[PDB]
Design a binder for this molecule. Structure first.
Ligand SMILES: *[C@@H]1O[C@H](CO)[C@@H](O[C@@H]2O[C@H](CO)[C@@H](O[C@@H]3O[C@H](CO)[C@@H](O)[C@H](O)[C@@H]3O)[C@H](O)[C@H]2NC(C)=O)[C@H](O)[C@H]1NC(C)=O
Ligand SMILES: *[C@H]1O[C@H](CO)[C@@H](O[C@@H]2O[C@H](CO)[C@@H](O[C@@H]3O[C@H](CO)[C@@H](O)[C@H](O)[C@@H]3O)[C@H](O)[C@H]2NC(C)=O)[C@H](O)[C@H]1NC(C)=O
Lengths: 214, 215
């Protein structure tokens, strides 16, 4: 029942910090008996994977994870990266590939919402952002407050879903993100921003500002 | 890998249509050979399961589902219900339990959003609803248009999540977001829409907010 997954980097690590890693996860290993996880890149050059990590599980199994740095330029070029697992119980090696989307691509539309008027009596108000119409589904949302990054613990973003069949090359997707802010700060004119990070955007990210209107 | 899932009744079934059912889903069945799905409860009383339903799939496997009517009162009571599956490939019976969360409750707050002004030049606009601040996490969202029900295929609601710690919210409060794309002409023409939340903590177990284009 050995399963192998090749996990793509997050849009944030690819397009904001440019320090992305590919990750390979192997599950349901009966042991590390002749276990090996190896990476291959399609083009000339080398890869330098991090040390592989073995975890024990309560269900009596083992999992192995291996991460490898990938440059954003290499990712964007369309290069394919392949992880392969060998094991005593594996008659044939298992491989999975990961690479930048080659299917249809469509940039996200970003719609910021100010607090509902009925929230303004409360000590905190909700700023939110609908991001929709995009392909592929991989997207990251970040927030800024007075031009500085907001910690992830201070907002929440919904898991990406296909849009309803009426909303519009296949499904498009959407996410919604919201951030509770102090009412005094909102009323004070602080500028906030919701940022989408997505491969189909001109510069790979775009932001829309929110600020109280006079 | 035969798997078993126990599925609670929805708030709509519990409070609106009053036809709640517990459901059991078995996946990856190689066959119906010696298949049996049985239910048990905690209090004295005979459960009356619906007949089992089987489906053959393209991936070669079979799935089975079993539904059992449950009264809203019995569900709200916190009684635990268990579905058990036996099959020739199972050395021992497989079981899962389902029951209501009986912790503290808090009613949702519903905030409807008209289309962003930038959407009005498109052929469709998005109506949406943020529903937040509630406990427990079980909730159902429905939409109406001119007092008529909108089919579930015409809108999407996000999977419920805990709110961020600053929200702030007992323990965690939860939120969902629901949106419905409508023809811009229907919005501009003055149709009255409504987003409705069904939740156990509301006085009448539901509440709604209307959305209509303003002058
Ligand atoms: C035994 O117990 C472990 C407990 O974790 C199970 O491993 C989990 O297996 C699932 C898939 O079967 C993994 O989900 C995967 O998540 C990645 C993203 O992280 C996603 O890309 C894949 O689609 C996949 O769904 C999960 O990560 C993994 N948990 C960990 C941390 O290793 C295992 O399945 C159990 N085996 C049995 C049958 O008892
Ligand atoms: C072969 O195809 C069938 C049908 O697509 C697959 O059956 C499905 O299996 C998944 C889980 O692996 C089920 O998802 C479950 O959905 C319930 C809905 O309440 C959810 O609560 C659970 O958390 C779970 O994720 C899915 O319902 C089930 N059947 C259907 C109708 O899709 C099956 O997995 C495939 N088998 C293999 C091994 O290829």
């Amino acid at each position: 029942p050995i399963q192998l997954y090749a996990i793509p980097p997050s849009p944030g690590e690819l397009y904001i910090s440019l320090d992305a890693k590919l990750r390979c996860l192997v599950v349901n290993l009966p042991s590390d008996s002749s276990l090996s996880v190896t990476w291959t890149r399609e083009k000339s050059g080398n890869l330098r994977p991090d040390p592989m990590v073995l975890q024990e599980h309560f269900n009596g199994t083992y999992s192995a994870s291996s991460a490898v740095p990938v440059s954003t330029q290499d990712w964007l070029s369309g290069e394919r990266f392949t992880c392969t697992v060998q094991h005593e119980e594996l008659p044939l090696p298992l491989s999975k590939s990961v690479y930048r989307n080659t299917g249809p691509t469509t940039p996200p539309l970003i719609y910021p919402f100010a607090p509902h008027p009925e929230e303004l009596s409360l000590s905190r108000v909700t700023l939110s952002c609908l991001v929709r119409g995009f392909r592929p589904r991989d997207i990251e949302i970040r927030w800024l407050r007075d031009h500085r990054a907001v910690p992830a613990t201070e907002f929440v973003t919904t898991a990406v879903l296909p849009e309803e069949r009426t909303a519009n090359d296949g499904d498009t997707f959407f996410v919604y993100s919201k951030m509770s802010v102090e009412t005094a700060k909102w009323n004070g004119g602080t500028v906030f921003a919701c940022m989408a990070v997505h491969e189909a955007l001109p510069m790979r990210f775009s932001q829309r500002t929110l600020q109280k209107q006079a």
